Amino acid sequence: TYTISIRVYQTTPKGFFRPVERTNWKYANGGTWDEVRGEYVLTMGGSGTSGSLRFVSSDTDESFVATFGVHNYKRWCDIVTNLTNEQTALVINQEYYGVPIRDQARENQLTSYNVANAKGRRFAIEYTVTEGDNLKANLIIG
Amino acid sequence: TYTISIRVYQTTPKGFFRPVERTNWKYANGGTWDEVRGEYVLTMGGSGTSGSLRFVSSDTDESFVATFGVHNYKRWCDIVTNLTNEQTALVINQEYYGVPIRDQARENQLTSYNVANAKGRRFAIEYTVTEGDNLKANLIIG
Amino acid sequence: TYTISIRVYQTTPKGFFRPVERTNWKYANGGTWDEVRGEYVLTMGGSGTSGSLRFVSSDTDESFVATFGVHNYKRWCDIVTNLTNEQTALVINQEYYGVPIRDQARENQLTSYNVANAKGRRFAIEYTVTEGDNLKANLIIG
Amino acid sequence: TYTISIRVYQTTPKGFFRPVERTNWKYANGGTWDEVRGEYVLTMGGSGTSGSLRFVSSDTDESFVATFGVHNYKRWCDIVTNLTNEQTALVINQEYYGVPIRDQARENQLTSYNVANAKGRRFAIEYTVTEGDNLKANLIIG
Ligand SMILES: CC(=O)N[C@@H]1[C@@H](O[C@@H]2O[C@H](CO)[C@H](O)[C@H](O)[C@H]2O)[C@H](O)[C@@H](CO)O[C@@H]1O
Ligand SMILES: CC(=O)N[C@@H]1[C@@H](O[C@@H]2O[C@H](CO)[C@H](O)[C@H](O)[C@H]2O)[C@H](O)[C@@H](CO)O[C@@H]1O
Ligand SMILES: CC(=O)N[C@@H]1[C@@H](O[C@@H]2O[C@H](CO)[C@H](O)[C@H](O)[C@H]2O)[C@H](O)[C@@H](CO)O[C@@H]1O
Ligand SMILES: CC(=O)N[C@@H]1[C@@H](O[C@@H]2O[C@H](CO)[C@H](O)[C@H](O)[C@H]2O)[C@H](O)[C@@H](CO)O[C@@H]1O
């Protein structure tokens, strides 16, 4: 059993990103999302699965999906932005198990990642605890 | 644009079901989940899509996925229980758009649905507003 | 350090009670309220303090304040209903440290309590774990 | 009836402030706290009351209470930090109605306020809508 506990930081008062979706991939006995002490907690039944969070800023027509998981006993993460309306977290979560470019992101087993949207705003995941059963990450909205 | 506002009634202090997942299907320009005044609000960009909520009772090894949507401009719902660990909301939500036994439930455009798990616990969805752009439903856990 | 973890059960689809306020009394180094895995968690820095939750049903003009605490190393609880608009949780929480009838409720160190409003609806607190540092209770809305 | 909708911006991934308390003062027919689309919404029954939010960073031994209200039909705000353990939101909210150094802050009817704690961290409230029945404010944690 793994947990990934996520702290969300919204760093600029320009626009407002709100949570809109949280998904669980089906591998390794699946997993759950819990809110715990102001954090988003992804619990997974083993290595080889993941969960996604989608955030939307309707003020500025911006959005992103942040995905967190464990691949071969090492944590991984990715962010997808410039989302079409068809790119919900349900859709994006699954792409990490069949789409080569997404597969590669997972295989990278990154402790940190960033990507910018077409509007120039950057998003980042930073694992602050990178080892063990109880992993911790910052999700930073630029 | 459609909304479905959901009030959750957990009626029996035997076990405890907690929210663990909320998904959005990709059709009809997708959708979002919001928490508003203690209610779950599914917003959708048109007719032909849906969203799912999974709840889990860890104390009693119970779980269910409740799905809400609009099909051909009429609201629909379904509940799936007796879940395997591989049946996350991500999985179940998507099955309503390709799996015949799930497709048919969606096509029924039901204003109410009730089901029991193997342990005899009943789960129900009852729409209280069944027409118009802003729909309302009770989710009742027995 | 004590925690009291509270599971809220709303048992009838008649009206809808939503959370509106959560307060902490100042004794024993104060305390906090956290949402953890769908539960309300009151953490307190020792014996001799408490915290309150207020719920409101605007559909039916009903409300109540449920208070939980530890007095002389034994848990206690009370519910106040038939609230005036001036009876917020902030007000009610404090009354257990100066108002004789409220003082008495606290001194009772009850594992369970119930009270009905003028509309005939009953509310109950039931401690399921009554001893130790990590206490658990059901808040049942009739 | 007044509303104040609050967007929280936690801007620095050094420490983590989590919500721990939300209180309502008793004047002007009281009020409520709601979570709406990722925002905190304080609703009040008239002019002359307020509500408080306490946030705590356990990692860094930091905390603050942010208070929002309407005084003589104009919005007001204040932040208190460097809190003792006895200074819960319940305590602080009430002090704005009898304690001179707090009364004066309320009477200032400020559209913006900023303060630093002993460790040098800045906290700010900035109203984005300053007139009418439905007010809006950013709460910025530095
Ligand atoms: C150890 C590990 O991380 N393995 C993953 C593997 O996860 C496993 O998937 C199977 C079903 O395919 C099953 O759910 C099992 O419980 C999981 O541990 C992934 O399938 C692949 C991605 O293709 O990556 C690793 O091998
Ligand atoms: C109007 C309606 O309810 N139609 C649905 C249809 O939804 C549409 O799907 C397409 C993509 O196929 C697109 O997303 C469009 O925006 C939607 O309105 C569903 O595809 C089907 C599923 O069987 O059911 C109706 O025809
Ligand atoms: C052990 C216990 O429960 N004692 C309470 C007492 O709590 C204590 O209050 C003082 C300040 O008065 C201080 O905050 C200390 O940390 C607390 O443990 C209560 O004051 C009284 C109620 O009047 O009840 C017990 O004695
Ligand atoms: C209109 C206004 O803002 N007045 C406030 C006043 O609020 C009123 O308080 C009384 C009880 O004293 C009652 O609750 C009424 O509904 C409120 O409008 C405040 O009491 C004072 C605090 O100094 O400030 C103004 O006068």
PDB file of N, CA, C and O in Angstrom, chain C residues 18-26 29-35 54 56 85-86 88 90-91 93-94, chain D residues 18-26 29-35 54 56 85-86 88 90-91 93-94:
ATOM      1  N   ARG C  18     -26.634  20.819   5.938  1.00  0.00           N
ATOM      2  CA  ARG C  18     -25.287  21.053   5.420  1.00  0.00           C
ATOM      3  C   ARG C  18     -24.428  21.675   6.523  1.00  0.00           C
ATOM      4  O   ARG C  18     -24.958  22.378   7.384  1.00  0.00           O
ATOM      5  N   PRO C  19     -23.116  21.417   6.512  1.00  0.00           N
ATOM      6  CA  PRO C  19     -22.211  22.017   7.505  1.00  0.00           C
ATOM      7  C   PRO C  19     -22.063  23.523   7.280  1.00  0.00           C
ATOM      8  O   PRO C  19     -21.936  23.945   6.129  1.00  0.00           O
ATOM      9  N   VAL C  20     -22.076  24.315   8.352  1.00  0.00           N
ATOM     10  CA  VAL C  20     -21.994  25.770   8.218  1.00  0.00           C
ATOM     11  C   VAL C  20     -20.981  26.458   9.139  1.00  0.00           C
ATOM     12  O   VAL C  20     -20.703  27.641   8.970  1.00  0.00           O
ATOM     13  N   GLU C  21     -20.435  25.722  10.107  1.00  0.00           N
ATOM     14  CA  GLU C  21     -19.565  26.322  11.119  1.00  0.00           C
ATOM     15  C   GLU C  21     -18.861  25.249  11.936  1.00  0.00           C
ATOM     16  O   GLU C  21     -19.450  24.215  12.245  1.00  0.00           O
ATOM     17  N   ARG C  22     -17.599  25.498  12.272  1.00  0.00           N
ATOM     18  CA  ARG C  22     -16.852  24.620  13.171  1.00  0.00           C
ATOM     19  C   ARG C  22     -15.912  25.430  14.052  1.00  0.00           C
ATOM     20  O   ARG C  22     -15.081  26.194  13.554  1.00  0.00           O
ATOM     21  N   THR C  23     -16.060  25.258  15.364  1.00  0.00           N
ATOM     22  CA  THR C  23     -15.390  26.119  16.338  1.00  0.00           C
ATOM     23  C   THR C  23     -14.528  25.317  17.303  1.00  0.00           C
ATOM     24  O   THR C  23     -14.768  24.126  17.520  1.00  0.00           O
ATOM     25  N   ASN C  24     -13.546  25.992  17.893  1.00  0.00           N
ATOM     26  CA  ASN C  24     -12.666  25.396  18.891  1.00  0.00           C
ATOM     27  C   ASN C  24     -12.611  26.228  20.158  1.00  0.00           C
ATOM     28  O   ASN C  24     -12.351  27.433  20.106  1.00  0.00           O
ATOM     29  N   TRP C  25     -12.876  25.585  21.292  1.00  0.00           N
ATOM     30  CA  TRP C  25     -12.702  26.227  22.590  1.00  0.00           C
ATOM     31  C   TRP C  25     -11.212  26.362  22.939  1.00  0.00           C
ATOM     32  O   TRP C  25     -10.369  25.616  22.427  1.00  0.00           O
ATOM     33  N   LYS C  26     -10.912  27.314  23.818  1.00  0.00           N
ATOM     34  CA  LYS C  26      -9.553  27.807  24.041  1.00  0.00           C
ATOM     35  C   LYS C  26      -8.739  27.069  25.112  1.00  0.00           C
ATOM     36  O   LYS C  26      -7.521  27.232  25.178  1.00  0.00           O
ATOM     37  N   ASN C  29      -4.721  24.186  25.507  1.00  0.00           N
ATOM     38  CA  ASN C  29      -3.979  24.531  24.289  1.00  0.00           C
ATOM     39  C   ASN C  29      -4.815  24.516  23.002  1.00  0.00           C
ATOM     40  O   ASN C  29      -4.280  24.371  21.896  1.00  0.00           O
ATOM     41  N   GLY C  30      -6.123  24.689  23.165  1.00  0.00           N
ATOM     42  CA  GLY C  30      -7.046  24.800  22.050  1.00  0.00           C
ATOM     43  C   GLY C  30      -7.230  23.504  21.289  1.00  0.00           C
ATOM     44  O   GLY C  30      -7.167  22.411  21.853  1.00  0.00           O
ATOM     45  N   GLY C  31      -7.452  23.630  19.987  1.00  0.00           N
ATOM     46  CA  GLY C  31      -7.692  22.470  19.151  1.00  0.00           C
ATOM     47  C   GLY C  31      -7.980  22.878  17.727  1.00  0.00           C
ATOM     48  O   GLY C  31      -8.025  24.070  17.420  1.00  0.00           O
ATOM     49  N   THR C  32      -8.165  21.889  16.859  1.00  0.00           N
ATOM     50  CA  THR C  32      -8.423  22.140  15.444  1.00  0.00           C
ATOM     51  C   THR C  32      -9.527  21.229  14.929  1.00  0.00           C
ATOM     52  O   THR C  32      -9.835  20.198  15.541  1.00  0.00           O
ATOM     53  N   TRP C  33     -10.115  21.621  13.801  1.00  0.00           N
ATOM     54  CA  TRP C  33     -11.000  20.757  13.027  1.00  0.00           C
ATOM     55  C   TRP C  33     -10.350  20.416  11.688  1.00  0.00           C
ATOM     56  O   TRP C  33      -9.893  21.310  10.970  1.00  0.00           O
ATOM     57  N   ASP C  34     -10.313  19.125  11.358  1.00  0.00           N
ATOM     58  CA  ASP C  34      -9.848  18.667  10.054  1.00  0.00           C
ATOM     59  C   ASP C  34     -10.892  17.787   9.402  1.00  0.00           C
ATOM     60  O   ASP C  34     -11.626  17.076  10.086  1.00  0.00           O
ATOM     61  N   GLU C  35     -10.952  17.837   8.075  1.00  0.00           N
ATOM     62  CA  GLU C  35     -11.697  16.844   7.318  1.00  0.00           C
ATOM     63  C   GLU C  35     -10.718  15.735   6.942  1.00  0.00           C
ATOM     64  O   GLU C  35      -9.671  15.989   6.342  1.00  0.00           O
ATOM     65  N   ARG C  54     -21.970  23.223  13.582  1.00  0.00           N
ATOM     66  CA  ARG C  54     -23.337  23.630  13.287  1.00  0.00           C
ATOM     67  C   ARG C  54     -23.748  23.137  11.904  1.00  0.00           C
ATOM     68  O   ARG C  54     -22.965  23.213  10.950  1.00  0.00           O
ATOM     69  N   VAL C  56     -27.206  23.250   9.109  1.00  0.00           N
ATOM     70  CA  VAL C  56     -28.426  23.983   8.780  1.00  0.00           C
ATOM     71  C   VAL C  56     -29.158  23.311   7.628  1.00  0.00           C
ATOM     72  O   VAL C  56     -28.540  22.932   6.629  1.00  0.00           O
ATOM     73  N   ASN C  85     -31.281  32.784  15.542  1.00  0.00           N
ATOM     74  CA  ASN C  85     -30.250  33.223  14.605  1.00  0.00           C
ATOM     75  C   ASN C  85     -28.981  33.707  15.317  1.00  0.00           C
ATOM     76  O   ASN C  85     -27.903  33.741  14.724  1.00  0.00           O
ATOM     77  N   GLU C  86     -29.122  34.059  16.597  1.00  0.00           N
ATOM     78  CA  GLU C  86     -28.001  34.522  17.420  1.00  0.00           C
ATOM     79  C   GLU C  86     -27.215  33.359  18.030  1.00  0.00           C
ATOM     80  O   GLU C  86     -26.157  33.563  18.634  1.00  0.00           O
ATOM     81  N   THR C  88     -25.113  30.867  17.087  1.00  0.00           N
ATOM     82  CA  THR C  88     -24.111  30.227  16.241  1.00  0.00           C
ATOM     83  C   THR C  88     -23.298  29.262  17.100  1.00  0.00           C
ATOM     84  O   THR C  88     -23.394  29.288  18.334  1.00  0.00           O
ATOM     85  N   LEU C  90     -20.136  29.386  17.562  1.00  0.00           N
ATOM     86  CA  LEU C  90     -19.239  30.237  18.346  1.00  0.00           C
ATOM     87  C   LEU C  90     -19.853  30.533  19.716  1.00  0.00           C
ATOM     88  O   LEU C  90     -19.186  30.418  20.748  1.00  0.00           O
ATOM     89  N   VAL C  91     -21.130  30.909  19.704  1.00  0.00           N
ATOM     90  CA  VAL C  91     -21.871  31.230  20.921  1.00  0.00           C
ATOM     91  C   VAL C  91     -22.063  29.974  21.769  1.00  0.00           C
ATOM     92  O   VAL C  91     -21.692  29.955  22.944  1.00  0.00           O
ATOM     93  N   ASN C  93     -20.645  26.865  21.737  1.00  0.00           N
ATOM     94  CA  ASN C  93     -19.413  26.234  22.225  1.00  0.00           C
ATOM     95  C   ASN C  93     -18.988  26.800  23.583  1.00  0.00           C
ATOM     96  O   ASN C  93     -18.642  26.048  24.501  1.00  0.00           O
ATOM     97  N   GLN C  94     -19.032  28.127  23.694  1.00  0.00           N
ATOM     98  CA  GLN C  94     -18.567  28.850  24.882  1.00  0.00           C
ATOM     99  C   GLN C  94     -19.465  28.654  26.098  1.00  0.00           C
ATOM    100  O   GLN C  94     -19.011  28.769  27.241  1.00  0.00           O
TER     101      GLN C  94
ATOM    102  N   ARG D  18      -3.313  24.796   6.572  1.00  0.00           N
ATOM    103  CA  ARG D  18      -4.544  24.051   6.339  1.00  0.00           C
ATOM    104  C   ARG D  18      -5.677  24.712   7.121  1.00  0.00           C
ATOM    105  O   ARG D  18      -5.432  25.295   8.179  1.00  0.00           O
ATOM    106  N   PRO D  19      -6.904  24.634   6.609  1.00  0.00           N
ATOM    107  CA  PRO D  19      -8.056  25.222   7.303  1.00  0.00           C
ATOM    108  C   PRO D  19      -8.393  24.411   8.561  1.00  0.00           C
ATOM    109  O   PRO D  19      -8.412  23.181   8.501  1.00  0.00           O
ATOM    110  N   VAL D  20      -8.624  25.087   9.684  1.00  0.00           N
ATOM    111  CA  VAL D  20      -8.857  24.389  10.947  1.00  0.00           C
ATOM    112  C   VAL D  20     -10.084  24.860  11.711  1.00  0.00           C
ATOM    113  O   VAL D  20     -10.488  24.230  12.683  1.00  0.00           O
ATOM    114  N   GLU D  21     -10.678  25.967  11.275  1.00  0.00           N
ATOM    115  CA  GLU D  21     -11.772  26.570  12.024  1.00  0.00           C
ATOM    116  C   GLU D  21     -12.483  27.634  11.205  1.00  0.00           C
ATOM    117  O   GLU D  21     -11.852  28.383  10.467  1.00  0.00           O
ATOM    118  N   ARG D  22     -13.802  27.674  11.323  1.00  0.00           N
ATOM    119  CA  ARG D  22     -14.594  28.735  10.701  1.00  0.00           C
ATOM    120  C   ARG D  22     -15.756  29.093  11.614  1.00  0.00           C
ATOM    121  O   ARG D  22     -16.546  28.231  11.992  1.00  0.00           O
ATOM    122  N   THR D  23     -15.830  30.366  11.986  1.00  0.00           N
ATOM    123  CA  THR D  23     -16.774  30.811  13.002  1.00  0.00           C
ATOM    124  C   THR D  23     -17.711  31.875  12.467  1.00  0.00           C
ATOM    125  O   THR D  23     -17.393  32.571  11.505  1.00  0.00           O
ATOM    126  N   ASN D  24     -18.867  31.998  13.109  1.00  0.00           N
ATOM    127  CA  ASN D  24     -19.818  33.048  12.787  1.00  0.00           C
ATOM    128  C   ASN D  24     -20.165  33.853  14.025  1.00  0.00           C
ATOM    129  O   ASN D  24     -20.549  33.289  15.052  1.00  0.00           O
ATOM    130  N   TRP D  25     -20.025  35.173  13.924  1.00  0.00           N
ATOM    131  CA  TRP D  25     -20.471  36.060  14.993  1.00  0.00           C
ATOM    132  C   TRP D  25     -22.001  36.150  14.977  1.00  0.00           C
ATOM    133  O   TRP D  25     -22.631  35.869  13.959  1.00  0.00           O
ATOM    134  N   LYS D  26     -22.582  36.547  16.109  1.00  0.00           N
ATOM    135  CA  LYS D  26     -24.019  36.410  16.360  1.00  0.00           C
ATOM    136  C   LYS D  26     -24.911  37.584  15.947  1.00  0.00           C
ATOM    137  O   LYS D  26     -26.141  37.442  15.935  1.00  0.00           O
ATOM    138  N   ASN D  29     -28.548  38.752  12.661  1.00  0.00           N
ATOM    139  CA  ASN D  29     -29.145  37.434  12.408  1.00  0.00           C
ATOM    140  C   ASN D  29     -28.144  36.337  12.030  1.00  0.00           C
ATOM    141  O   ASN D  29     -28.487  35.368  11.342  1.00  0.00           O
ATOM    142  N   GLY D  30     -26.912  36.506  12.505  1.00  0.00           N
ATOM    143  CA  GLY D  30     -25.857  35.531  12.313  1.00  0.00           C
ATOM    144  C   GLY D  30     -25.433  35.360  10.870  1.00  0.00           C
ATOM    145  O   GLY D  30     -25.541  36.278  10.049  1.00  0.00           O
ATOM    146  N   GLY D  31     -24.951  34.162  10.565  1.00  0.00           N
ATOM    147  CA  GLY D  31     -24.418  33.861   9.254  1.00  0.00           C
ATOM    148  C   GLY D  31     -23.962  32.425   9.150  1.00  0.00           C
ATOM    149  O   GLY D  31     -24.088  31.653  10.102  1.00  0.00           O
ATOM    150  N   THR D  32     -23.439  32.065   7.983  1.00  0.00           N
ATOM    151  CA  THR D  32     -22.988  30.701   7.718  1.00  0.00           C
ATOM    152  C   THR D  32     -21.689  30.710   6.921  1.00  0.00           C
ATOM    153  O   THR D  32     -21.347  31.708   6.282  1.00  0.00           O
ATOM    154  N   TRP D  33     -20.974  29.588   6.968  1.00  0.00           N
ATOM    155  CA  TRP D  33     -19.863  29.330   6.057  1.00  0.00           C
ATOM    156  C   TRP D  33     -20.237  28.186   5.124  1.00  0.00           C
ATOM    157  O   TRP D  33     -20.709  27.142   5.575  1.00  0.00           O
ATOM    158  N   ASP D  34     -20.030  28.393   3.828  1.00  0.00           N
ATOM    159  CA  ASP D  34     -20.219  27.343   2.833  1.00  0.00           C
ATOM    160  C   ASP D  34     -18.955  27.209   2.008  1.00  0.00           C
ATOM    161  O   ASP D  34     -18.207  28.175   1.835  1.00  0.00           O
ATOM    162  N   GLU D  35     -18.713  26.000   1.515  1.00  0.00           N
ATOM    163  CA  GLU D  35     -17.713  25.788   0.478  1.00  0.00           C
ATOM    164  C   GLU D  35     -18.447  25.742  -0.854  1.00  0.00           C
ATOM    165  O   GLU D  35     -19.374  24.953  -1.025  1.00  0.00           O
ATOM    166  N   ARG D  54      -9.490  30.289  10.547  1.00  0.00           N
ATOM    167  CA  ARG D  54      -8.150  30.025  11.066  1.00  0.00           C
ATOM    168  C   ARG D  54      -7.436  29.004  10.186  1.00  0.00           C
ATOM    169  O   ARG D  54      -8.043  28.030   9.724  1.00  0.00           O
ATOM    170  N   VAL D  56      -3.558  26.852   9.945  1.00  0.00           N
ATOM    171  CA  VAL D  56      -2.398  26.432  10.732  1.00  0.00           C
ATOM    172  C   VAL D  56      -1.381  25.707   9.853  1.00  0.00           C
ATOM    173  O   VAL D  56      -1.751  24.825   9.067  1.00  0.00           O
ATOM    174  N   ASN D  85      -1.901  29.495  21.734  1.00  0.00           N
ATOM    175  CA  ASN D  85      -2.750  28.319  21.547  1.00  0.00           C
ATOM    176  C   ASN D  85      -4.184  28.565  22.012  1.00  0.00           C
ATOM    177  O   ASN D  85      -5.106  27.843  21.627  1.00  0.00           O
ATOM    178  N   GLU D  86      -4.349  29.601  22.830  1.00  0.00           N
ATOM    179  CA  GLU D  86      -5.649  29.989  23.371  1.00  0.00           C
ATOM    180  C   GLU D  86      -6.419  30.894  22.408  1.00  0.00           C
ATOM    181  O   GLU D  86      -7.601  31.149  22.610  1.00  0.00           O
ATOM    182  N   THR D  88      -8.021  30.787  19.421  1.00  0.00           N
ATOM    183  CA  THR D  88      -8.737  30.111  18.344  1.00  0.00           C
ATOM    184  C   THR D  88      -9.547  31.167  17.596  1.00  0.00           C
ATOM    185  O   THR D  88      -9.641  32.316  18.046  1.00  0.00           O
ATOM    186  N   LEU D  90     -12.723  31.160  17.339  1.00  0.00           N
ATOM    187  CA  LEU D  90     -13.820  31.434  18.270  1.00  0.00           C
ATOM    188  C   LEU D  90     -13.483  32.629  19.161  1.00  0.00           C
ATOM    189  O   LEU D  90     -14.310  33.520  19.353  1.00  0.00           O
ATOM    190  N   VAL D  91     -12.262  32.640  19.698  1.00  0.00           N
ATOM    191  CA  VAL D  91     -11.804  33.734  20.557  1.00  0.00           C
ATOM    192  C   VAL D  91     -11.646  35.033  19.757  1.00  0.00           C
ATOM    193  O   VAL D  91     -12.231  36.065  20.115  1.00  0.00           O
ATOM    194  N   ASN D  93     -12.675  36.004  16.633  1.00  0.00           N
ATOM    195  CA  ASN D  93     -13.900  36.535  16.031  1.00  0.00           C
ATOM    196  C   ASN D  93     -14.667  37.417  17.022  1.00  0.00           C
ATOM    197  O   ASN D  93     -15.098  38.519  16.675  1.00  0.00           O
ATOM    198  N   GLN D  94     -14.797  36.927  18.254  1.00  0.00           N
ATOM    199  CA  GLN D  94     -15.568  37.589  19.309  1.00  0.00           C
ATOM    200  C   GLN D  94     -14.915  38.883  19.809  1.00  0.00           C
ATOM    201  O   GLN D  94     -15.614  39.799  20.271  1.00  0.00           O
TER     202      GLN D  94
END
